[PDB]
Amino acid sequence: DRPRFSFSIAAREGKARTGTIEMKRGVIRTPAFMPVGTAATVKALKPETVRATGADIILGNTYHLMLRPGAERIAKLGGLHSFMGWDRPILTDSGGYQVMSLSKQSEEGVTFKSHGSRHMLSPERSIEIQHLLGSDIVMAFDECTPYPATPSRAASSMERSMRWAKRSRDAFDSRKEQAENAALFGIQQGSVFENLRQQSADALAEIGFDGYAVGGLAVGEGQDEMFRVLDFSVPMLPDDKPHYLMGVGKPDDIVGAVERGIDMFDCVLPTRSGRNGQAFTWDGPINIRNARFSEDLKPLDSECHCAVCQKWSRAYIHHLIRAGEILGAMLMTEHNIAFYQQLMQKIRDSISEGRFSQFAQDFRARYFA
């Protein structure tokens, strides 16, 4: 009854869009934020809590899960959805970034040492691992180069990534169960160079994908440069397909990226920085460990609708985090993920109502005040 993958744009304002991706396991409202669930858990949250915050889809990692607990093992246990208890869509990263980030490169693929066993990844093996996991949105396997990259290392990694994108496409299409029930996204590369981004976009559009990610950003280029690259890169992608900015980001990063045509986001910031004591508020981030919160009976944020802000004070959460208590990480993480989802809802509503430009201005004025 439900479709494999149907993206519908309900409203536009400038370059920003809002709409839905319908998939067999559920609907994804866009612009969407995906909580990161690296090792088959969104850290410190039950899946029901992740859903309660408003998340429609989570992200899992091919590289981590292939090492622990193992992709064939997860398949034997019934797939990633059943294993971790999340029955809605899951997007899996292909492994390319973490192989470079955490762990021998050739045209066939890459061999590497686990962060210390030896493992192989290729476009075909990445697609097969994501099939074994049961991913709903499969990412093409690419080759990343560190930042800052020379123009030579940018062009060579990009063209190989495009050759690997065609191999990923073919491996995915060769697996009937995958091609009938999942979607495949290609990844635009080319670093900060407009002509390479164009060559990458053209190659991916020639192959044909369900969605297009902007890769190679959120690697330490600063917000000004990221926005500058998004300015020319997103219009190169097919307008009628979703645009996914990998690894981004801070709340203001997300707002500016939506203003430039991005529909999907993932980032560890709300979870990781929550465990570290950083809470997001409409008046900017706060560090709850600061002594100024020790007797503050207000919730983390005065407008937030999350269950944490309905029940517990800053003072209590300050105590938990300073004491190293697990409940501190749980409450900070639930609030931060809920805050991110409320940001996405405000973005979606304001685009639908044709007042997203004003929302972005009002958001920034208060958030950086």
Ligand X SMILES: NNC(=O)c1ccc2nc(NCCN3CCOCC3)[nH]c2c1
Phi/psi of residue 63, each to 5°? -65, -45
List the one residue from 127, 203, 246, 255 that touches ligand X (CB under 6 A).
246
Out of 210, 253, 266, 301, pick the active-site residue: 266
Is 266 a residue of the active site?
Answer: yes
Q: What, of a copy of itself, ligand X, Cl ion, none, does residue 96 touch, CB below 5 to 8 Å by kind?
A: ligand X
Chain residues binding a copy of itself by CB under 8 A are: 39-41, 43-46, 68-69, 73, 76-78, 83-85, 294-295, 297, 311-313, 315-316, 319-320, 322-323, 325-327, 329-330
What distance in Å separates the CA atoms of residue 90 and residue 131, rounded to the nearest whole number? 12
| 222 among annotated binding-site residues | no
Burial class (CB in 10 A: 0-12, 13-18, 19+), 361: exposed
As beta bridge partners, residue 183 has 137
Plot region of 284 (φ>0 → left; ψ -120 to 50 → alpha; else → beta):
left
**Using an 8 Å Cβ cutoff, are 262 and 289 in contact?**
no
Compute the distance between CA of residue 109 and CA of residue 348 in angstroms, rounded to an integer. 39
Size of the site for Zn ion (CB under 5 A): 5
In 3D space, the residue among 215, 206, 141 whose CA is nearest the CA of residue 172 turns out to be: 141
Q: Which is nearer to ligand X, 129 or 144 (CB)?
A: 144
Choose the one of ligand X, Cl ion, a copy of itself, none that binds residue 239, judging by a C-beta under 5 to 8 angstroms depending on kind: none
Q: How far is the CB of 232 from ligand X (least distance, A)?
A: 17
User: Residue 246: which of Cl ion, ligand X, a copy of itself, none does it interact with, CB under 5 to 8 A by kind?
Assistant: ligand X
The 247-266 site mask, x for binding ligand X (CB under 6 A), equals x-------------------
327 binds Cl ion (CB under 5 A): no
16 forms part of the interface with ligand X (CB under 6 A): no
Q: Which position among 93, 136, 210, 253 bears the catalytic label?
A: 93
94 is in an annotated binding site: yes
Q: What is the DSSP letter of 39?
A: T
> Is 53 in contact with 47 (CB distance < 8 Å)?
no
Which residues neighbour 39 within 8 Å (Cβ) at sequence distance 6 or greater?
Answer: 61, 64, 65, 68
Quickly count: other Cβ atoms within 10 Å of residue 124's Cβ.
18
* Per CB under 6 A, 218 contacts ligand X: yes
Q: Least distance (Å) from ligand X to the CB of residue 97?
A: 4
CB atoms within 10 A of CB 173: 12
Q: Which residues are annotated as a binding site for Zn(2+)?
A: 304, 306, 309, 335
Binding site for Cl ion (CB under 5 A): 43, 268, 271-272
Binding site for ligand X (CB under 6 A): 96-97, 142, 144, 187, 215-216, 218-219, 246-247
Q: Which residues are annotated as a binding site for substrate?
A: 93-97, 142, 189, 216
Catalytic residues: 93, 266
